[PDB]
Amino acid sequence: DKATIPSESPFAAAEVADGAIVVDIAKMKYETPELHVKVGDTVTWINREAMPHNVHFVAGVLGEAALKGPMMKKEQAYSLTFTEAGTYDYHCTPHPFKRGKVVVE
Ligand SMILES: [Zn+2]
Ligand SMILES: [Zn+2]
């Protein structure tokens, strides 16, 4: 598997480290729809809207099974640590037309 999960459930945005790699979730888009990180980096998504959103990697992308992230409320965060190089597309489960990617290099 190509990513590990530091926290199975969403956590408070106030707990995200200074300097962290962050993708804000907005209504109309993940604010960084194509993010490049280094192998071993942790990416943190933070929901900035009241509408719940998540991140969802379909089966085959981070491994054999899908990785459907938990639904995040406003000012909640969720992190993934990417352990192999590759390009990993994801989307928001309830709003599947909103999509992003992480390029790990
Ligand atoms: Zn790059
Ligand atoms: Zn959404």
mmCIF file of N, CA and C and ligand atoms in Angstrom:
data_model
loop_
_atom_site.group_PDB
_atom_site.id
_atom_site.type_symbol
_atom_site.label_atom_id
_atom_site.label_comp_id
_atom_site.label_asym_id
_atom_site.label_seq_id
_atom_site.Cartn_x
_atom_site.Cartn_y
_atom_site.Cartn_z
ATOM 1 N N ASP A 1 0.797 -1.182 0.000
ATOM 2 C CA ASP A 1 0.000 0.000 0.000
ATOM 3 C C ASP A 1 0.826 1.225 0.000
ATOM 4 N N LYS A 2 0.256 2.242 -0.591
ATOM 5 C CA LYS A 2 1.075 3.371 -0.981
ATOM 6 C C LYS A 2 0.897 4.587 -0.087
ATOM 7 N N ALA A 3 0.045 4.469 0.912
ATOM 8 C CA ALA A 3 -0.114 5.523 1.907
ATOM 9 C C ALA A 3 -0.511 4.946 3.250
ATOM 10 N N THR A 4 -0.048 5.593 4.327
ATOM 11 C CA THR A 4 -0.470 5.231 5.668
ATOM 12 C C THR A 4 -1.342 6.350 6.226
ATOM 13 N N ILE A 5 -2.117 6.018 7.258
ATOM 14 C CA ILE A 5 -3.098 6.936 7.824
ATOM 15 C C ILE A 5 -2.750 7.284 9.263
ATOM 16 N N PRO A 6 -2.225 8.492 9.479
ATOM 17 C CA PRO A 6 -1.856 8.871 10.842
ATOM 18 C C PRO A 6 -3.023 8.891 11.790
ATOM 19 N N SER A 7 -4.214 9.246 11.357
ATOM 20 C CA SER A 7 -5.384 9.319 12.254
ATOM 21 C C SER A 7 -6.572 8.793 11.521
ATOM 22 N N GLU A 8 -7.164 7.704 11.987
ATOM 23 C CA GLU A 8 -8.281 7.137 11.282
ATOM 24 C C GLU A 8 -9.463 8.044 11.231
ATOM 25 N N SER A 9 -9.649 8.887 12.238
ATOM 26 C CA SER A 9 -10.786 9.795 12.235
ATOM 27 C C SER A 9 -10.320 11.223 12.015
ATOM 28 N N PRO A 10 -11.209 12.075 11.542
ATOM 29 C CA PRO A 10 -10.805 13.477 11.377
ATOM 30 C C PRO A 10 -10.430 14.081 12.730
ATOM 31 N N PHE A 11 -9.594 15.102 12.698
ATOM 32 C CA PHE A 11 -9.180 15.764 13.926
ATOM 33 C C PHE A 11 -9.269 17.269 13.760
ATOM 34 N N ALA A 12 -9.112 18.012 14.854
ATOM 35 C CA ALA A 12 -9.274 19.463 14.812
ATOM 36 C C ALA A 12 -8.194 20.134 13.977
ATOM 37 N N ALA A 13 -8.603 21.055 13.127
ATOM 38 C CA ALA A 13 -7.640 21.795 12.303
ATOM 39 C C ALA A 13 -6.589 22.491 13.162
ATOM 40 N N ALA A 14 -6.967 22.851 14.386
ATOM 41 C CA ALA A 14 -6.042 23.554 15.285
ATOM 42 C C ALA A 14 -4.811 22.717 15.651
ATOM 43 N N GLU A 15 -4.903 21.409 15.413
ATOM 44 C CA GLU A 15 -3.844 20.453 15.695
ATOM 45 C C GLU A 15 -2.864 20.207 14.567
ATOM 46 N N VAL A 16 -3.078 20.797 13.426
ATOM 47 C CA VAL A 16 -2.167 20.672 12.328
ATOM 48 C C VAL A 16 -0.930 21.491 12.546
ATOM 49 N N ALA A 17 0.209 20.882 12.333
ATOM 50 C CA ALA A 17 1.463 21.518 12.606
ATOM 51 C C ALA A 17 1.708 22.717 11.796
ATOM 52 N N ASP A 18 2.509 23.595 12.339
ATOM 53 C CA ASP A 18 2.951 24.706 11.551
ATOM 54 C C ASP A 18 3.847 24.162 10.454
ATOM 55 N N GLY A 19 3.762 24.743 9.281
ATOM 56 C CA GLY A 19 4.526 24.296 8.139
ATOM 57 C C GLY A 19 3.973 23.093 7.390
ATOM 58 N N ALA A 20 2.903 22.514 7.904
ATOM 59 C CA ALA A 20 2.381 21.321 7.274
ATOM 60 C C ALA A 20 1.977 21.610 5.847
ATOM 61 N N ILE A 21 2.052 20.572 5.016
ATOM 62 C CA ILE A 21 1.496 20.572 3.660
ATOM 63 C C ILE A 21 -0.001 20.431 3.780
ATOM 64 N N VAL A 22 -0.718 21.446 3.322
ATOM 65 C CA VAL A 22 -2.164 21.520 3.504
ATOM 66 C C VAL A 22 -2.899 21.770 2.199
ATOM 67 N N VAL A 23 -3.985 21.030 2.004
ATOM 68 C CA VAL A 23 -4.928 21.274 0.898
ATOM 69 C C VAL A 23 -6.238 21.675 1.537
ATOM 70 N N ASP A 24 -6.661 22.911 1.295
ATOM 71 C CA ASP A 24 -7.960 23.366 1.811
ATOM 72 C C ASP A 24 -9.068 22.829 0.909
ATOM 73 N N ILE A 25 -10.168 22.406 1.517
ATOM 74 C CA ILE A 25 -11.345 22.009 0.752
ATOM 75 C C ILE A 25 -12.343 23.149 0.767
ATOM 76 N N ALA A 26 -12.695 23.531 -0.449
ATOM 77 C CA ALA A 26 -13.677 24.534 -0.722
ATOM 78 C C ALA A 26 -14.860 23.931 -1.472
ATOM 79 N N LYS A 27 -15.906 24.714 -1.589
ATOM 80 C CA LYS A 27 -17.046 24.245 -2.325
ATOM 81 C C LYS A 27 -16.723 23.816 -3.712
ATOM 82 N N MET A 28 -16.066 24.676 -4.366
ATOM 83 C CA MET A 28 -15.989 24.440 -5.737
ATOM 84 C C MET A 28 -14.761 23.673 -6.186
ATOM 85 N N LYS A 29 -13.870 23.405 -5.250
ATOM 86 C CA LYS A 29 -12.634 22.730 -5.567
ATOM 87 C C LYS A 29 -11.814 22.432 -4.345
ATOM 88 N N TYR A 30 -10.938 21.436 -4.458
ATOM 89 C CA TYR A 30 -9.823 21.347 -3.562
ATOM 90 C C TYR A 30 -8.938 22.514 -3.987
ATOM 91 N N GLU A 31 -8.510 23.336 -3.038
ATOM 92 C CA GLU A 31 -7.800 24.588 -3.416
ATOM 93 C C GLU A 31 -6.479 24.338 -4.137
ATOM 94 N N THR A 32 -5.884 23.177 -3.901
ATOM 95 C CA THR A 32 -4.710 22.766 -4.632
ATOM 96 C C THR A 32 -5.064 21.468 -5.337
ATOM 97 N N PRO A 33 -5.613 21.575 -6.545
ATOM 98 C CA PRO A 33 -6.121 20.391 -7.258
ATOM 99 C C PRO A 33 -5.028 19.460 -7.768
ATOM 100 N N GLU A 34 -3.793 19.961 -7.902
ATOM 101 C CA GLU A 34 -2.657 19.117 -8.221
ATOM 102 C C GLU A 34 -1.512 19.482 -7.279
ATOM 103 N N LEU A 35 -1.254 18.610 -6.338
ATOM 104 C CA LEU A 35 -0.255 18.843 -5.315
ATOM 105 C C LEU A 35 0.909 17.887 -5.533
ATOM 106 N N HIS A 36 2.132 18.420 -5.513
ATOM 107 C CA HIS A 36 3.332 17.595 -5.624
ATOM 108 C C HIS A 36 4.034 17.543 -4.270
ATOM 109 N N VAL A 37 4.373 16.341 -3.829
ATOM 110 C CA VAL A 37 5.069 16.154 -2.562
ATOM 111 C C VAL A 37 6.189 15.158 -2.782
ATOM 112 N N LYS A 38 7.044 15.058 -1.782
ATOM 113 C CA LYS A 38 8.185 14.131 -1.833
ATOM 114 C C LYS A 38 7.811 12.777 -1.199
ATOM 115 N N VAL A 39 8.422 11.657 -1.582
ATOM 116 C CA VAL A 39 8.119 10.370 -0.930
ATOM 117 C C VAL A 39 8.320 10.518 0.559
ATOM 118 N N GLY A 40 7.366 10.010 1.339
ATOM 119 C CA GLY A 40 7.407 10.104 2.778
ATOM 120 C C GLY A 40 6.672 11.289 3.371
ATOM 121 N N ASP A 41 6.283 12.252 2.531
ATOM 122 C CA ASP A 41 5.548 13.435 3.005
ATOM 123 C C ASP A 41 4.130 13.109 3.443
ATOM 124 N N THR A 42 3.634 13.886 4.405
ATOM 125 C CA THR A 42 2.268 13.802 4.854
ATOM 126 C C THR A 42 1.494 14.983 4.298
ATOM 127 N N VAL A 43 0.341 14.702 3.734
ATOM 128 C CA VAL A 43 -0.549 15.732 3.189
ATOM 129 C C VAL A 43 -1.716 15.796 4.124
ATOM 130 N N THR A 44 -2.158 17.024 4.454
ATOM 131 C CA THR A 44 -3.314 17.204 5.319
ATOM 132 C C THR A 44 -4.410 18.011 4.602
ATOM 133 N N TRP A 45 -5.621 17.466 4.574
ATOM 134 C CA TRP A 45 -6.738 18.205 3.995
ATOM 135 C C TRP A 45 -7.508 18.841 5.141
ATOM 136 N N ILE A 46 -7.966 20.063 4.936
ATOM 137 C CA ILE A 46 -8.762 20.733 5.960
ATOM 138 C C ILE A 46 -10.019 21.262 5.302
ATOM 139 N N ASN A 47 -11.168 20.851 5.831
ATOM 140 C CA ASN A 47 -12.449 21.359 5.346
ATOM 141 C C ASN A 47 -12.704 22.781 5.860
ATOM 142 N N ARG A 48 -12.782 23.722 4.933
ATOM 143 C CA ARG A 48 -13.032 25.110 5.313
ATOM 144 C C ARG A 48 -14.519 25.530 5.183
ATOM 145 N N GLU A 49 -15.384 24.605 4.777
ATOM 146 C CA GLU A 49 -16.818 24.869 4.578
ATOM 147 C C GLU A 49 -17.654 24.135 5.625
ATOM 148 N N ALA A 50 -18.902 24.543 5.795
ATOM 149 C CA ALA A 50 -19.809 23.831 6.688
ATOM 150 C C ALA A 50 -20.307 22.519 6.136
ATOM 151 N N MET A 51 -20.514 22.445 4.833
ATOM 152 C CA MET A 51 -20.830 21.213 4.130
ATOM 153 C C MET A 51 -19.718 20.198 4.344
ATOM 154 N N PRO A 52 -20.063 18.973 4.769
ATOM 155 C CA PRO A 52 -19.000 17.977 4.937
ATOM 156 C C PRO A 52 -18.404 17.549 3.606
ATOM 157 N N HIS A 53 -17.093 17.333 3.609
ATOM 158 C CA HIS A 53 -16.405 16.775 2.439
ATOM 159 C C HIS A 53 -15.441 15.698 2.878
ATOM 160 N N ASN A 54 -14.890 14.966 1.917
ATOM 161 C CA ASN A 54 -13.846 13.994 2.250
ATOM 162 C C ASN A 54 -12.861 13.874 1.117
ATOM 163 N N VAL A 55 -11.968 12.901 1.238
ATOM 164 C CA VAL A 55 -11.113 12.502 0.115
ATOM 165 C C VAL A 55 -11.283 11.010 -0.068
ATOM 166 N N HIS A 56 -11.357 10.576 -1.326
ATOM 167 C CA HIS A 56 -11.700 9.205 -1.660
ATOM 168 C C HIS A 56 -10.830 8.760 -2.841
ATOM 169 N N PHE A 57 -9.972 7.779 -2.590
ATOM 170 C CA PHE A 57 -9.108 7.211 -3.632
ATOM 171 C C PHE A 57 -9.710 5.867 -4.053
ATOM 172 N N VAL A 58 -10.067 5.724 -5.330
ATOM 173 C CA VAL A 58 -10.766 4.516 -5.769
ATOM 174 C C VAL A 58 -9.850 3.287 -5.729
ATOM 175 N N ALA A 59 -10.459 2.111 -5.774
ATOM 176 C CA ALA A 59 -9.714 0.875 -5.670
ATOM 177 C C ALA A 59 -8.595 0.832 -6.710
ATOM 178 N N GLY A 60 -7.413 0.405 -6.277
ATOM 179 C CA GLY A 60 -6.278 0.284 -7.181
ATOM 180 C C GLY A 60 -5.313 1.464 -7.128
ATOM 181 N N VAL A 61 -5.768 2.586 -6.581
ATOM 182 C CA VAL A 61 -4.934 3.800 -6.597
ATOM 183 C C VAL A 61 -3.881 3.778 -5.453
ATOM 184 N N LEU A 62 -4.291 3.576 -4.184
ATOM 185 C CA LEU A 62 -3.349 3.509 -3.029
ATOM 186 C C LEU A 62 -3.136 2.073 -2.604
ATOM 187 N N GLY A 63 -3.725 1.169 -3.376
ATOM 188 C CA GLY A 63 -3.640 -0.242 -3.063
ATOM 189 C C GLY A 63 -4.839 -0.926 -3.626
ATOM 190 N N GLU A 64 -5.057 -2.135 -3.160
ATOM 191 C CA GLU A 64 -6.114 -2.906 -3.767
ATOM 192 C C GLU A 64 -7.484 -2.424 -3.413
ATOM 193 N N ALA A 65 -7.617 -2.005 -2.195
ATOM 194 C CA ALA A 65 -8.878 -1.497 -1.780
ATOM 195 C C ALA A 65 -8.945 0.016 -1.965
ATOM 196 N N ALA A 66 -10.154 0.538 -2.061
ATOM 197 C CA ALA A 66 -10.331 1.981 -2.041
ATOM 198 C C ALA A 66 -9.920 2.522 -0.681
ATOM 199 N N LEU A 67 -9.543 3.799 -0.644
ATOM 200 C CA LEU A 67 -9.352 4.487 0.615
ATOM 201 C C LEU A 67 -10.374 5.608 0.633
ATOM 202 N N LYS A 68 -11.488 5.363 1.282
ATOM 203 C CA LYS A 68 -12.493 6.368 1.442
ATOM 204 C C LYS A 68 -12.337 7.090 2.773
ATOM 205 N N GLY A 69 -11.892 8.322 2.716
ATOM 206 C CA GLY A 69 -11.646 9.044 3.932
ATOM 207 C C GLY A 69 -12.930 9.324 4.672
ATOM 208 N N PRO A 70 -12.842 9.534 5.994
ATOM 209 C CA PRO A 70 -14.034 9.867 6.789
ATOM 210 C C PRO A 70 -14.508 11.246 6.436
ATOM 211 N N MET A 71 -15.797 11.469 6.655
ATOM 212 C CA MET A 71 -16.352 12.759 6.320
ATOM 213 C C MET A 71 -15.879 13.821 7.313
ATOM 214 N N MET A 72 -15.432 14.965 6.812
ATOM 215 C CA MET A 72 -14.866 15.995 7.650
ATOM 216 C C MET A 72 -15.826 17.164 7.752
ATOM 217 N N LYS A 73 -16.059 17.620 8.963
ATOM 218 C CA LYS A 73 -16.874 18.794 9.200
ATOM 219 C C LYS A 73 -16.001 19.997 9.064
ATOM 220 N N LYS A 74 -16.609 21.118 9.302
ATOM 221 C CA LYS A 74 -15.877 22.313 9.163
ATOM 222 C C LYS A 74 -14.734 22.450 10.177
ATOM 223 N N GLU A 75 -13.579 22.901 9.702
ATOM 224 C CA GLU A 75 -12.341 22.986 10.493
ATOM 225 C C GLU A 75 -11.893 21.651 11.062
ATOM 226 N N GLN A 76 -12.279 20.574 10.395
ATOM 227 C CA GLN A 76 -11.689 19.290 10.702
ATOM 228 C C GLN A 76 -10.668 18.952 9.615
ATOM 229 N N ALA A 77 -9.681 18.160 9.980
ATOM 230 C CA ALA A 77 -8.558 17.821 9.093
ATOM 231 C C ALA A 77 -8.406 16.314 9.019
ATOM 232 N N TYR A 78 -7.706 15.859 7.986
ATOM 233 C CA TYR A 78 -7.456 14.435 7.768
ATOM 234 C C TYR A 78 -6.149 14.338 6.987
ATOM 235 N N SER A 79 -5.285 13.406 7.385
ATOM 236 C CA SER A 79 -3.937 13.308 6.824
ATOM 237 C C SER A 79 -3.653 11.943 6.196
ATOM 238 N N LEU A 80 -2.793 11.961 5.192
ATOM 239 C CA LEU A 80 -2.293 10.720 4.593
ATOM 240 C C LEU A 80 -0.800 10.877 4.394
ATOM 241 N N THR A 81 -0.034 9.816 4.675
ATOM 242 C CA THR A 81 1.413 9.849 4.471
ATOM 243 C C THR A 81 1.737 8.953 3.270
ATOM 244 N N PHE A 82 2.324 9.544 2.234
ATOM 245 C CA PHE A 82 2.530 8.845 0.999
ATOM 246 C C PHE A 82 3.915 8.206 0.985
ATOM 247 N N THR A 83 3.965 6.897 0.724
ATOM 248 C CA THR A 83 5.207 6.138 0.904
ATOM 249 C C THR A 83 5.826 5.625 -0.402
ATOM 250 N N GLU A 84 5.142 5.787 -1.524
ATOM 251 C CA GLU A 84 5.717 5.450 -2.808
ATOM 252 C C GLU A 84 5.467 6.569 -3.779
ATOM 253 N N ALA A 85 6.401 6.655 -4.709
ATOM 254 C CA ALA A 85 6.267 7.570 -5.823
ATOM 255 C C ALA A 85 5.144 7.115 -6.763
ATOM 256 N N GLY A 86 4.410 8.084 -7.305
ATOM 257 C CA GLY A 86 3.337 7.819 -8.247
ATOM 258 C C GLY A 86 2.392 9.009 -8.310
ATOM 259 N N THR A 87 1.298 8.850 -9.040
ATOM 260 C CA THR A 87 0.289 9.899 -9.161
ATOM 261 C C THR A 87 -1.046 9.324 -8.722
ATOM 262 N N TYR A 88 -1.652 9.981 -7.736
ATOM 263 C CA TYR A 88 -2.813 9.397 -7.055
ATOM 264 C C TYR A 88 -4.012 10.357 -7.118
ATOM 265 N N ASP A 89 -5.004 9.986 -7.905
ATOM 266 C CA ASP A 89 -6.210 10.809 -8.041
ATOM 267 C C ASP A 89 -7.198 10.499 -6.940
ATOM 268 N N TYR A 90 -7.969 11.514 -6.539
ATOM 269 C CA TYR A 90 -9.005 11.333 -5.542
ATOM 270 C C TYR A 90 -10.195 12.236 -5.819
ATOM 271 N N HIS A 91 -11.270 11.979 -5.120
ATOM 272 C CA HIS A 91 -12.450 12.864 -5.264
ATOM 273 C C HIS A 91 -13.225 12.909 -3.975
ATOM 274 N N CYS A 92 -14.263 13.745 -3.948
ATOM 275 C CA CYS A 92 -15.115 13.856 -2.765
ATOM 276 C C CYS A 92 -16.345 12.969 -2.929
ATOM 277 N N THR A 93 -16.542 12.051 -1.988
ATOM 278 C CA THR A 93 -17.560 11.011 -2.180
ATOM 279 C C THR A 93 -18.962 11.538 -2.496
ATOM 280 N N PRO A 94 -19.466 12.467 -1.673
ATOM 281 C CA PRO A 94 -20.820 12.997 -1.942
ATOM 282 C C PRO A 94 -20.863 13.966 -3.110
ATOM 283 N N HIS A 95 -19.718 14.513 -3.496
ATOM 284 C CA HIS A 95 -19.632 15.494 -4.584
ATOM 285 C C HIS A 95 -18.531 15.051 -5.545
ATOM 286 N N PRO A 96 -18.753 13.937 -6.240
ATOM 287 C CA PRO A 96 -17.696 13.204 -6.956
ATOM 288 C C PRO A 96 -17.116 13.881 -8.144
ATOM 289 N N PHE A 97 -17.922 14.730 -8.706
ATOM 290 C CA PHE A 97 -17.352 15.645 -9.617
ATOM 291 C C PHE A 97 -16.237 16.573 -9.024
ATOM 292 N N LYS A 98 -15.963 16.749 -7.753
ATOM 293 C CA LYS A 98 -14.800 17.521 -7.240
ATOM 294 C C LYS A 98 -13.653 16.562 -7.063
ATOM 295 N N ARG A 99 -12.575 16.819 -7.778
ATOM 296 C CA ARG A 99 -11.492 15.867 -7.823
ATOM 297 C C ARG A 99 -10.152 16.565 -7.714
ATOM 298 N N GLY A 100 -9.131 15.835 -7.224
ATOM 299 C CA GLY A 100 -7.784 16.343 -7.059
ATOM 300 C C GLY A 100 -6.787 15.237 -7.336
ATOM 301 N N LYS A 101 -5.509 15.606 -7.232
ATOM 302 C CA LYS A 101 -4.505 14.560 -7.275
ATOM 303 C C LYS A 101 -3.326 14.941 -6.409
ATOM 304 N N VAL A 102 -2.585 13.906 -6.010
ATOM 305 C CA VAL A 102 -1.303 14.064 -5.343
ATOM 306 C C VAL A 102 -0.268 13.373 -6.197
ATOM 307 N N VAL A 103 0.764 14.117 -6.585
ATOM 308 C CA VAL A 103 1.881 13.542 -7.316
ATOM 309 C C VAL A 103 3.025 13.396 -6.324
ATOM 310 N N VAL A 104 3.497 12.172 -6.117
ATOM 311 C CA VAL A 104 4.523 11.889 -5.134
ATOM 312 C C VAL A 104 5.813 11.592 -5.889
ATOM 313 N N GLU A 105 6.864 12.362 -5.589
ATOM 314 C CA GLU A 105 8.043 12.321 -6.470
ATOM 315 C C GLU A 105 9.341 12.423 -5.691
HETATM 316 ZN ZN ZN B 1 6.684 18.209 -9.081
HETATM 317 ZN ZN ZN B 2 -17.346 17.708 -1.409
#
